[PDB]
Amino acid sequence: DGEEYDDPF
Amino acid sequence: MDQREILQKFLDEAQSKKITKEEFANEFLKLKRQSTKYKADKTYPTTVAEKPKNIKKNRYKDILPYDYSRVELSLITSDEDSSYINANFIKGVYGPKAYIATQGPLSTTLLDFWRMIWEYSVLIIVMACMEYEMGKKKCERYWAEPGEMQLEFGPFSVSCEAEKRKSDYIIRTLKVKFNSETRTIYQFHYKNWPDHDVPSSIDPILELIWDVRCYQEDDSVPICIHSSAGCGRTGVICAIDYTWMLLKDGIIPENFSVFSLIREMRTQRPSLVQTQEQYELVYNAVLELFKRQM
Protein backbone atom coordinates (compact mmCIF):
# COMPACT_ATOMS: atom_id res chain seq x y z
CA ASP A 1 0.00 0.00 0.00
CA GLY A 2 3.04 2.17 -0.71
CA GLU A 3 1.17 5.37 -1.62
CA GLU A 4 2.73 7.03 1.44
CA TYR A 5 0.56 7.18 4.55
CA ASP A 6 1.32 10.91 4.53
CA ASP A 7 -0.93 12.17 1.77
CA PRO A 8 -3.56 14.09 3.77
CA PHE A 9 -3.69 17.83 4.63
CA MET B 1 -2.37 21.13 43.90
CA ASP B 2 -4.06 17.83 44.76
CA GLN B 3 -5.74 15.84 41.98
CA ARG B 4 -9.24 17.33 41.58
CA GLU B 5 -7.53 20.74 41.67
CA ILE B 6 -5.27 20.11 38.67
CA LEU B 7 -8.32 18.91 36.72
CA GLN B 8 -10.17 22.17 37.33
CA LYS B 9 -7.14 24.14 36.19
CA PHE B 10 -7.47 22.00 33.06
CA LEU B 11 -11.24 22.21 32.47
CA ASP B 12 -11.06 25.85 33.52
CA GLU B 13 -8.43 26.50 30.84
CA ALA B 14 -10.74 24.80 28.34
CA GLN B 15 -13.25 27.60 27.89
CA SER B 16 -10.21 29.40 26.48
CA LYS B 17 -8.30 26.84 24.40
CA LYS B 18 -11.64 25.93 22.85
CA ILE B 19 -12.60 29.40 21.60
CA THR B 20 -9.14 30.77 20.71
CA LYS B 21 -8.53 30.83 16.96
CA GLU B 22 -6.71 27.86 15.41
CA GLU B 23 -5.65 26.72 18.89
CA PHE B 24 -5.09 23.12 17.80
CA ALA B 25 -3.98 24.10 14.30
CA ASN B 26 -1.03 26.25 15.39
CA GLU B 27 -0.47 23.67 18.11
CA PHE B 28 -0.45 20.64 15.82
CA LEU B 29 1.91 22.77 13.71
CA LYS B 30 4.61 22.56 16.39
CA LEU B 31 4.57 18.77 16.31
CA LYS B 32 4.74 18.61 12.52
CA ARG B 33 7.68 21.00 12.83
CA GLN B 34 9.16 19.02 15.72
CA SER B 35 9.48 15.93 13.55
CA THR B 36 10.98 18.23 10.95
CA LYS B 37 13.82 19.53 13.09
CA TYR B 38 14.27 16.09 14.65
CA LYS B 39 14.57 15.03 11.00
CA ALA B 40 16.75 17.46 9.04
CA ASP B 41 19.20 16.82 11.88
CA LYS B 42 19.07 13.07 11.35
CA THR B 43 18.23 12.87 15.05
CA TYR B 44 16.82 9.33 14.70
CA PRO B 45 18.55 6.82 12.39
CA THR B 46 16.30 4.30 10.64
CA THR B 47 18.82 2.20 8.67
CA VAL B 48 17.25 -1.01 9.96
CA ALA B 49 14.06 -0.30 7.99
CA GLU B 50 16.12 1.35 5.27
CA LYS B 51 17.67 -2.10 4.80
CA PRO B 52 16.79 -3.77 1.48
CA LYS B 53 15.70 -6.93 3.29
CA ASN B 54 12.91 -4.96 4.99
CA ILE B 55 11.60 -2.36 2.52
CA LYS B 56 8.93 -4.87 1.41
CA LYS B 57 7.79 -5.32 5.01
CA ASN B 58 7.15 -1.57 5.17
CA ARG B 59 3.48 -0.89 4.40
CA TYR B 60 4.06 2.83 3.87
CA LYS B 61 7.41 4.09 2.52
CA ASP B 62 7.19 7.10 4.81
CA ILE B 63 5.94 5.55 8.06
CA LEU B 64 9.19 3.98 9.31
CA PRO B 65 10.01 2.59 12.80
CA TYR B 66 12.93 4.03 14.75
CA ASP B 67 15.99 1.91 15.46
CA TYR B 68 16.45 3.37 18.93
CA SER B 69 12.96 2.16 19.95
CA ARG B 70 11.79 -0.43 17.41
CA VAL B 71 10.90 -3.96 18.45
CA GLU B 72 13.58 -6.60 17.75
CA LEU B 73 12.45 -10.16 17.03
CA SER B 74 14.52 -13.07 18.27
CA LEU B 75 12.10 -15.97 18.55
CA ILE B 76 13.41 -17.67 15.39
CA THR B 77 11.11 -19.66 13.08
CA SER B 78 13.47 -20.23 10.12
CA ASP B 79 16.46 -18.70 8.35
CA GLU B 80 13.72 -17.19 6.19
CA ASP B 81 13.43 -14.57 8.93
CA SER B 82 15.03 -11.41 10.28
CA SER B 83 15.00 -9.40 13.51
CA TYR B 84 13.17 -6.49 11.88
CA ILE B 85 9.52 -5.48 12.03
CA ASN B 86 7.48 -2.31 11.75
CA ALA B 87 6.70 -1.39 15.34
CA ASN B 88 8.08 0.67 18.18
CA PHE B 89 8.14 0.46 21.93
CA ILE B 90 6.16 3.22 23.64
CA LYS B 91 6.81 3.98 27.31
CA GLY B 92 3.96 4.09 29.79
CA VAL B 93 3.35 6.12 32.94
CA TYR B 94 5.70 3.91 35.00
CA GLY B 95 8.03 2.18 32.54
CA PRO B 96 9.25 1.67 28.96
CA LYS B 97 8.03 -1.07 26.55
CA ALA B 98 4.39 -0.49 27.67
CA TYR B 99 2.88 -0.01 24.19
CA ILE B 100 3.74 -1.72 20.88
CA ALA B 101 2.55 0.57 18.09
CA THR B 102 2.77 -1.53 14.93
CA GLN B 103 1.39 -1.23 11.38
CA GLY B 104 -1.29 -3.25 9.61
CA PRO B 105 0.45 -6.54 8.84
CA LEU B 106 1.21 -7.08 5.18
CA SER B 107 1.02 -10.61 3.81
CA THR B 108 4.79 -10.83 3.93
CA THR B 109 4.63 -10.26 7.69
CA LEU B 110 1.70 -12.09 9.28
CA LEU B 111 4.43 -14.38 10.64
CA ASP B 112 6.56 -11.63 12.17
CA PHE B 113 3.34 -10.30 13.58
CA TRP B 114 2.89 -13.57 15.47
CA ARG B 115 6.54 -13.88 16.42
CA MET B 116 6.16 -10.44 18.04
CA ILE B 117 2.91 -11.20 19.90
CA TRP B 118 4.53 -14.40 21.10
CA GLU B 119 8.10 -13.38 21.91
CA TYR B 120 6.67 -10.69 24.18
CA SER B 121 3.86 -12.60 25.84
CA VAL B 122 1.38 -10.13 24.38
CA LEU B 123 -2.09 -10.58 25.86
CA ILE B 124 -4.04 -7.98 23.91
CA ILE B 125 -4.18 -6.50 20.43
CA VAL B 126 -6.28 -3.51 19.43
CA MET B 127 -7.10 -3.17 15.76
CA ALA B 128 -7.87 0.48 15.08
CA CYS B 129 -9.08 0.38 11.48
CA MET B 130 -11.00 -1.84 9.05
CA GLU B 131 -9.86 -4.31 6.41
CA TYR B 132 -11.08 -1.88 3.75
CA GLU B 133 -10.80 1.91 3.67
CA MET B 134 -11.32 4.35 0.79
CA GLY B 135 -11.90 1.45 -1.59
CA LYS B 136 -8.38 0.39 -0.67
CA LYS B 137 -6.80 -2.36 1.41
CA LYS B 138 -5.42 -1.28 4.77
CA CYS B 139 -4.87 -4.27 7.02
CA GLU B 140 -4.25 -7.88 6.01
CA ARG B 141 -6.06 -10.69 7.88
CA TYR B 142 -4.29 -12.07 10.95
CA TRP B 143 -7.17 -13.32 13.07
CA ALA B 144 -9.77 -16.13 13.10
CA GLU B 145 -13.58 -16.21 13.13
CA PRO B 146 -16.34 -18.64 14.31
CA GLY B 147 -16.84 -21.95 12.52
CA GLU B 148 -13.75 -20.99 10.53
CA MET B 149 -11.52 -23.64 12.14
CA GLN B 150 -7.98 -22.27 12.59
CA LEU B 151 -5.55 -20.30 10.42
CA GLU B 152 -1.89 -21.28 10.04
CA PHE B 153 0.88 -18.67 9.88
CA GLY B 154 4.37 -20.10 9.52
CA PRO B 155 4.60 -22.17 12.73
CA PHE B 156 1.73 -20.38 14.45
CA SER B 157 -1.81 -21.67 14.66
CA VAL B 158 -4.60 -19.17 15.33
CA SER B 159 -8.17 -20.21 16.07
CA CYS B 160 -11.32 -18.51 17.34
CA GLU B 161 -13.05 -19.55 20.54
CA ALA B 162 -15.71 -16.85 20.78
CA GLU B 163 -16.58 -13.24 19.97
CA LYS B 164 -18.21 -10.42 21.89
CA ARG B 165 -20.34 -7.86 20.05
CA LYS B 166 -20.33 -4.43 21.67
CA SER B 167 -21.78 -1.35 19.94
CA ASP B 168 -18.98 -0.06 17.68
CA TYR B 169 -16.41 -2.67 18.69
CA ILE B 170 -15.86 -6.45 18.94
CA ILE B 171 -13.94 -8.73 21.33
CA ARG B 172 -12.41 -11.73 19.59
CA THR B 173 -10.95 -14.42 21.83
CA LEU B 174 -8.05 -16.11 20.03
CA LYS B 175 -6.11 -19.28 20.77
CA VAL B 176 -2.61 -19.15 19.27
CA LYS B 177 -0.58 -22.37 19.44
CA PHE B 178 3.16 -22.89 19.09
CA ASN B 179 5.41 -25.89 19.74
CA SER B 180 2.95 -27.47 22.19
CA GLU B 181 1.94 -24.21 23.88
CA THR B 182 -1.56 -22.68 23.89
CA ARG B 183 -1.85 -19.06 25.10
CA THR B 184 -5.04 -16.96 25.05
CA ILE B 185 -5.35 -13.67 23.15
CA TYR B 186 -8.10 -11.08 23.51
CA GLN B 187 -7.90 -9.02 20.30
CA PHE B 188 -10.16 -5.97 20.06
CA HIS B 189 -11.77 -4.66 16.88
CA TYR B 190 -12.75 -1.04 16.47
CA LYS B 191 -14.43 0.02 13.23
CA ASN B 192 -16.35 3.19 14.12
CA TRP B 193 -13.92 6.07 14.67
CA PRO B 194 -15.24 8.83 17.02
CA ASP B 195 -16.50 12.11 15.56
CA HIS B 196 -13.75 14.48 16.74
CA ASP B 197 -16.30 17.25 16.35
CA VAL B 198 -19.38 15.56 17.80
CA PRO B 199 -19.09 15.02 21.60
CA SER B 200 -21.44 12.11 22.30
CA SER B 201 -19.54 10.10 19.67
CA ILE B 202 -16.31 9.64 21.64
CA ASP B 203 -17.65 7.37 24.39
CA PRO B 204 -17.03 4.30 22.18
CA ILE B 205 -13.27 4.82 22.21
CA LEU B 206 -13.32 5.37 25.96
CA GLU B 207 -15.46 2.25 26.28
CA LEU B 208 -12.98 0.19 24.26
CA ILE B 209 -10.04 1.45 26.32
CA TRP B 210 -12.14 1.00 29.46
CA ASP B 211 -12.69 -2.65 28.52
CA VAL B 212 -9.13 -3.40 27.49
CA ARG B 213 -7.79 -2.17 30.85
CA CYS B 214 -10.70 -4.04 32.34
CA TYR B 215 -8.82 -7.05 31.00
CA GLN B 216 -5.14 -6.22 31.60
CA GLU B 217 -5.25 -3.53 34.34
CA ASP B 218 -1.54 -3.72 35.19
CA ASP B 219 1.41 -3.21 32.81
CA SER B 220 3.04 -6.65 33.02
CA VAL B 221 3.01 -7.18 29.26
CA PRO B 222 3.01 -4.79 26.27
CA ILE B 223 -0.28 -3.97 24.64
CA CYS B 224 -0.11 -4.28 20.87
CA ILE B 225 -1.83 -1.39 19.07
CA HIS B 226 -2.12 -1.08 15.45
CA SER B 227 -4.02 0.84 12.78
CA SER B 228 -3.37 1.06 9.05
CA ALA B 229 0.15 2.57 9.65
CA GLY B 230 0.07 2.15 13.40
CA CYS B 231 0.24 5.93 13.78
CA GLY B 232 -2.79 8.16 13.61
CA ARG B 233 -5.55 6.22 15.33
CA THR B 234 -2.86 4.21 17.17
CA GLY B 235 -1.26 7.08 19.12
CA VAL B 236 -4.77 8.23 19.98
CA ILE B 237 -5.63 5.06 21.86
CA CYS B 238 -2.27 5.17 23.62
CA ALA B 239 -2.54 8.80 24.71
CA ILE B 240 -6.12 8.38 25.93
CA ASP B 241 -4.98 5.38 27.94
CA TYR B 242 -1.70 6.76 29.30
CA THR B 243 -3.63 9.86 30.43
CA TRP B 244 -6.33 7.69 32.01
CA MET B 245 -3.61 5.71 33.71
CA LEU B 246 -2.63 8.87 35.51
CA LEU B 247 -6.31 9.67 36.14
CA LYS B 248 -7.20 6.17 37.41
CA ASP B 249 -4.32 6.56 39.83
CA GLY B 250 -4.39 10.02 41.39
CA ILE B 251 -1.22 11.06 39.57
CA ILE B 252 -2.15 13.68 36.97
CA PRO B 253 0.81 16.13 36.77
CA GLU B 254 0.24 19.73 37.83
CA ASN B 255 1.53 20.85 34.45
CA PHE B 256 -0.07 18.01 32.49
CA SER B 257 -0.37 18.84 28.78
CA VAL B 258 -1.93 16.71 26.07
CA PHE B 259 0.63 18.41 23.80
CA SER B 260 3.80 17.35 25.61
CA LEU B 261 2.43 13.87 26.20
CA ILE B 262 1.86 13.48 22.45
CA ARG B 263 5.05 15.35 21.62
CA GLU B 264 6.96 12.77 23.66
CA MET B 265 5.58 9.49 22.26
CA ARG B 266 6.40 10.89 18.84
CA THR B 267 10.05 10.60 19.84
CA GLN B 268 9.61 6.86 20.32
CA ARG B 269 7.26 6.24 17.39
CA PRO B 270 7.18 8.51 14.29
CA SER B 271 4.11 10.46 13.18
CA LEU B 272 2.09 9.39 16.23
CA VAL B 273 -1.24 11.26 16.02
CA GLN B 274 -1.02 12.24 12.33
CA THR B 275 -3.63 14.99 11.90
CA GLN B 276 -5.32 17.93 13.57
CA GLU B 277 -8.73 16.23 13.71
CA GLN B 278 -7.07 13.44 15.68
CA TYR B 279 -5.07 15.82 17.86
CA GLU B 280 -8.46 17.21 18.86
CA LEU B 281 -9.99 13.82 19.66
CA VAL B 282 -7.24 12.96 22.12
CA TYR B 283 -7.84 16.26 23.94
CA ASN B 284 -11.66 16.21 23.76
CA ALA B 285 -11.59 12.65 25.09
CA VAL B 286 -9.13 13.61 27.84
CA LEU B 287 -11.46 16.54 28.50
CA GLU B 288 -14.51 14.26 28.66
CA LEU B 289 -12.61 11.88 30.95
CA PHE B 290 -11.52 14.59 33.36
CA LYS B 291 -15.08 15.90 33.50
CA ARG B 292 -16.05 12.40 34.61
CA GLN B 293 -13.49 12.06 37.41
CA MET B 294 -15.22 14.92 39.25
Side-chain angles (χ1 to χ4, degrees):
Chain A
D1 214 45
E3 186 192 356
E4 272 174 46
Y5 182 59
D6 157 83
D7 259 349
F9 355 108
Chain B
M1 306 171 82
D2 49 57
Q3 273 308 75
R4 173 184 273 280
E5 290 183 356
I6 304 175
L7 258 55
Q8 282 294 181
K9 174 191 172 181
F10 206 81
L11 289 307
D12 276 345
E13 298 177 64
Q15 286 74 309
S16 307
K17 292 299 206 310
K18 163 62 168 303
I19 304 301
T20 298
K21 285 210 170 306
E22 298 193 58
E23 176 77 64
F24 303 74
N26 287 291
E27 209 141 67
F28 175 45
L29 174 48
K30 299 185 190 303
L31 304 173
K32 290 276 292 194
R33 294 184 211 175
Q34 195 72 266
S35 298
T36 299
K37 192 59 183 296
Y38 266 136
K39 189 157 168 55
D41 303 41
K42 289 80 61 59
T43 301
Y44 283 153
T46 58
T47 38
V48 189
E50 305 282 295
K51 290 202 302 174
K53 53 174 289 179
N54 296 308
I55 308 176
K56 60 172 291 176
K57 309 172 184 177
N58 297 308
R59 178 185 279 301
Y60 298 109
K61 62 148 55 185
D62 41 19
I63 299 315
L64 311 180
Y66 293 123
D67 290 355
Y68 134 78
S69 48
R70 65 180 193 62
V71 184
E72 296 182 296
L73 310 195
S74 288
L75 166 45
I76 306 303
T77 50
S78 63
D79 58 294
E80 283 182 39
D81 302 310
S82 181
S83 61
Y84 181 87
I85 184 177
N86 203 295
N88 285 81
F89 292 111
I90 293 305
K91 300 185 180 65
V93 303
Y94 305 118
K97 300 177 164 69
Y99 293 118
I100 348 189
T102 195
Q103 62 174 56
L106 301 175
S107 56
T108 46
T109 62
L110 265 162
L111 172 64
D112 301 315
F113 194 83
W114 283 118
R115 296 163 59 187
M116 183 187 99
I117 308 289
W118 192 276
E119 186 204 314
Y120 286 99
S121 305
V122 184
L123 161 61
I124 280 189
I125 303 168
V126 177
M127 190 153 158
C129 73
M130 296 165 88
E131 303 186 61
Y132 283 114
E133 308 192 302
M134 302 165 68
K136 286 277 296 189
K137 178 62 63 54
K138 300 264 138 292
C139 175
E140 254 297 307
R141 166 75 86 67
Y142 61 27
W143 64 114
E145 307 163 58
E148 176 184 64
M149 205 65 81
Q150 47 166 61
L151 291 58
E152 303 282 336
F153 309 94
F156 293 84
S157 323
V158 188
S159 71
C160 188
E161 179 189 62
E163 310 188 310
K164 210 177 189 182
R165 290 274 185 174
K166 315 182 87 297
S167 58
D168 319 71
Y169 111 85
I170 307 172
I171 297 183
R172 283 170 188 137
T173 299
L174 302 196
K175 298 292 184 181
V176 190
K177 304 190 180 213
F178 183 53
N179 287 71
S180 305
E181 229 175 297
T182 312
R183 299 175 176 174
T184 292
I185 306 299
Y186 285 98
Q187 172 230 39
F188 294 89
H189 206 69
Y190 197 52
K191 277 191 174 299
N192 296 58
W193 196 244
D195 192 52
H196 98 302
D197 232 301
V198 173
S200 48
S201 83
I202 68 175
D203 307 306
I205 203 173
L206 300 181
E207 286 301 325
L208 160 67
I209 303 178
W210 160 271
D211 257 34
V212 168
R213 287 298 168 176
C214 199
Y215 269 55
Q216 187 195 312
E217 282 174 356
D218 66 277
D219 54 291
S220 48
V221 289
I223 290 184
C224 185
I225 305 174
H226 87 112
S227 50
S228 185
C231 289
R233 290 164 288 175
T234 306
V236 183
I237 306 181
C238 286
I240 299 181
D241 181 60
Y242 191 134
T243 297
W244 201 341
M245 198 58 84
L246 301 167
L247 239 197
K248 285 189 292 190
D249 303 324
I251 64 173
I252 299 287
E254 304 192 301
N255 79 309
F256 177 59
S257 82
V258 196
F259 176 83
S260 290
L261 162 49
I262 299 304
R263 195 213 316 181
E264 169 181 343
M265 302 181 151
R266 294 188 53 128
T267 60
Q268 306 180 75
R269 177 64 164 175
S271 294
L272 220 29
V273 175
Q274 186 61 57
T275 62
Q276 176 177 302
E277 291 78 77
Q278 301 196 302
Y279 181 80
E280 302 186 40
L281 178 48
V282 184
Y283 183 86
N284 292 313
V286 174
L287 203 50
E288 166 53 52
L289 279 181
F290 281 143
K291 291 193 167 190
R292 301 188 181 191
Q293 202 69 178
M294 304 301 264

